[PDB]
């Protein structure tokens, strides 16, 4: 069998909390009236929800309604319980109300409206400071919700909202978020392919907040190298290969030996032998400004197979890659 694993941080927080904090299936929901909210325009479609721009008609205030696509009651309480526990926290989206439509009784979540900015002109006026800054901001949310014993589990660019004019960032979609419990065994069919961590790729189930950190390493490696996506898999199985071909097969098998993962037999033919490439293989004429010895040392300290080896969010924020944003904050 496999080896059990525990987070190197925030390991038993949820155990030391009042039962109801994490027992979301027993959480009671006081479903409002969606008629307090008039839909304006369709903001996006996801796999378990649809998102509209709406107006609360008792202050003319601007909100966002997230009609939930039909799912097990269970998953809605999870996402609500996590939102309510994280409410107020640095850079976390603000759950404003929980309502059902009178006719459908289909549940929908009201959120704080954030003005995001067109990602077109976002990727063009993105400076090597801008990345540092906004990445620190995502860590504020990541370190918060982790300290609160919660894993986002879907940290991708589609889930980061930037109001560049105010420098306001909000980590969003918590529909996959879960409570960390030492010993608990979690599903591997979570997050999207391009940010899935190795643990997910080999079907290792006792992971933790380290999952969020790989995702973020992928996001960071995309922007400093100007390669969207950075690990470009055809399928889930080839995604590990696109990762192997950069991190080496050596550390990969060692990862597997250390946790004794029953590596799936397909793999045993498509991986192979590849060295641990040197990062400067990926810096070229168009991207050398975002790249710095500081940046690469942080990036190398996030993209590891050993989930236990990757930095923690707090450990990440004290890295020297962020010395400049910290000073200017104080």
Q: Between 134 and 204, whose beta carbon lies closer to ligand A1I90?
A: 134
Can you tell me which residue has the tokens 């790989």? 214
Q: How far is CA 225 from CA 117, 145, 285, 293, 311, in A?
A: 22, 28, 10, 13, 21
23 is catalytic: no
Rounded CA separation 1/290 (Å) = 43
Minimal distance in Å, beta carbon 19 to ligand A1I90? 26
Please report whether residue 292 would count as binding ligand A1I90 according to CB under 6 A.
no
Can residue 299 be called a binding residue for ligand A1I90 (CB under 6 A)?
Answer: no
Task: Decide if residue 119 touches ligand A1I90 (CB under 6 A).
Answer: yes
Q: How far is the CB of 65 from ligand A1I90 (least distance, A)?
A: 9
The response to whether 30 counts as a known ligand-binding position is no
Q: Residue 219 CB, nearest distance to ligand A1I90 (Å)? A: 5
SS3 state at 33: strand
Give the torsion through C-alpha atoms of 313, 315, 320, 325, to 10 deg: 40
Chain positions 55 to 84 lying near ligand A1I90, rule: CB under 6 A, are: 64, 66
Which residues within the stretch 199-238 sit at the binding site for ligand A1I90 (CB under 6 A)?
219-220, 223
- Catalytic position from the list 97, 143, 154, 212: 154
Q: How buried is residue 153: exposed, middle or buried, by Cβ count under 10 Å (0-12/13-18/19+)? A: buried
Q: For the CB of residue 279, give the shortest distance to ligand A1I90 in the complex, in Å.
A: 17
176 contacts ligand A1I90 (rule: CB under 6 A): no
- Residue whose pair of structure tokens reads 């109801």 in the numeric block: 20
Distance CA 69, CA 149 (A): 26
- Residue 62 bridge partners (DSSP): 55
Closest CA to 172 of 315, 49, 36: 49
* Residue 301, both tokens: 């300290």
Question: Which CB, 118 or 235, lies closer to ligand A1I90?
Answer: 118
Based on the shown chain and the rule CB under 6 A, indicate whether residue 259 belongs to the binding site for ligand A1I90.
no
Q: Is 46 annotated as a binding residue?
A: yes
Q: CA 94 to CA 87: how far, in whole Å? A: 6
- Please tell me whether 43 is known to bind a ligand: yes
Please give the residue ranges that form the binding site for ligand A1I90 (CB under 6 A): 43-44, 51, 64, 66, 93, 111, 113-114, 116, 119, 122, 131, 134-135, 157-158, 160-162, 172-174, 219-220, 223
Binding residues: 43-51, 66
């Amino acid at each position: 069998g496999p080896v059990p694993s525990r987070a190197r941080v925030y390991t038993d927080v949820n155990t030391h909390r009042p039962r109801e904090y994490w027992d979301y299936e027993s959480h009671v929901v006081e479903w409002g009236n969606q008629d307090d909210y008039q839909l304006v325009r369709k903001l996006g479609r996801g796999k378990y929800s649809e998102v509209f721009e709406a107006i609360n008609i008792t202050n003319n205030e601007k909100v966002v309604v997230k009609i939930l696509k039909p799912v097990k009651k269970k998953k809605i309480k999870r996402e609500i319980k996590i939102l309510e526990n994280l409410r107020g926290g640095p850079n976390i989206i603000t759950l404003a109300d929980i309502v059902k439509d009178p006719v459908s009784r289909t549940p929908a979540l009201v959120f704080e409206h954030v003005n995001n900015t067109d990602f077109k002109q976002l990727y063009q006026t993105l400076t090597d400071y801008d990345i540092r800054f906004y990445m620190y901001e995502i860590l504020k949310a990541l370190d918060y919700c982790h300290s609160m014993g919660i894993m986002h589990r879907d940290v991708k660019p589609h889930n980061v909202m930037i109001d560049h004019e105010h420098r306001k960032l909000r980590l969003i979609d918590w529909g996959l978020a879960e409570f960390y419990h030492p010993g608990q065994e979690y599903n591997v069919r979570v997050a999207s392919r391009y940010f899935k961590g190795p643990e997910l790729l080999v079907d290792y189930q006792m992971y933790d907040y380290s999952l969020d950190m790989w995702s973020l390493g992928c996001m960071l490696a995309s922007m400093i190298f100007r390669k969207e996506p950075f690990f470009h898999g055809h399928d889930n199985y080839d995604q590990l290969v696109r990762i192997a071909k950069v991190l080496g097969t050596e550390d990969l098998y060692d990862y597997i030996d250390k946790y004794n993962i029953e590596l799936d037999p397909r793999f045993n033919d498509i991986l192979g032998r590849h060295s641990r490439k040197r990062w400067e293989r990926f810096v070229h004429s168009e991207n050398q400004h975002l790249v710095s010895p500081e940046a690469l040392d942080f990036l190398d300290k996030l993209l590891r197979y050993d989930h236990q080896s990757r930095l923690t969010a707090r450990e990440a924020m004290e890295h020297p890659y962020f010395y400049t944003v910290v000073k200017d904050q104080a």
